[PDB]
Structures are given as C-alpha cells and as structure tokens.
C-alpha cells in the first residue's frame, strides 16, 4: 500500500516529506524506516509469539524510532526554547 506496511512507518516517512527535509535527509530516514520495518514485522512475530518477554527486542525498535525522530524531530521533543 505505502512505502511501508504498517501505518507507523508510513505516517513517519510521509511526515518527514511534510517537514520538507532535503533529499539526502529523506534517504537516510527512509533507510531507517525500512530497517525499522523489517525489525517491526520480524519482532511483531516475536511479541505475538511471546519472544520479547524481556522488553529487549521490542526495546530496540523504540530506540530506533527515537533515533529517526531524533534526526528529523518527526515526533520527539528536542526544542529547548
């Protein structure tokens, strides 16, 4: 349907496009969304089967989403003024 399968990667990427980021920027971001995508479905298999019972696998997905959102402030608070 969209560059990504879930609406979280789709909404994040398109969001970046709305931020008017430059091309190189949407390129590194898209790379992080694709890696976070395969990691979100593969992990979705984990959580669904009870693999991230420790919160480590699903945790890596959280840090990655914060890394992208941290590189594009697409959904993170970094402004101190």
From Swiss-Prot:
User: Could you say which residues of the full protein are shown?
Assistant: 51 to 131 of 357
User: What is an annotated GO biological process for this record, any one?
Assistant: extracellular negative regulation of signal transduction
Query: Where, subcellularly, is it found?
Result: Rough endoplasmic reticulum lumen; Endoplasmic reticulum-Golgi intermediate compartment lumen; Golgi apparatus, cis-Golgi network; Golgi apparatus lumen
Which Gene Ontology CC terms are recorded? Answer: cell surface; cis-Golgi network; endomembrane system; endoplasmic reticulum; endoplasmic reticulum-Golgi intermediate compartment; endosome; endosome lumen; extracellular region
Assembly, in brief, is:
Interacts with the LRP1/alpha-2-macroglobulin receptor heavy and light chains; the interaction is transient and coincides with a reduction of ligand binding by the receptor. Interacts with LRP2/glycoprotein 330. Interacts with LRP1B; binding is followed by internalization and degradation. Interacts with LDLR. Interacts with SORL1. Interacts with LRP1; this interaction is followed by rapid internalization.
What this chain does, per the entry, is described as: Molecular chaperone for LDL receptor-related proteins that may regulate their ligand binding activity along the secretory pathway.
For the keyword Phosphoprotein, the answer is yes
The answer to whether keyword Phosphoprotein applies is yes
Q: Which organism is it from?
A: Homo sapiens (Human)
- Name the UniProt record assigns to this protein: Alpha-2-macroglobulin receptor-associated protein
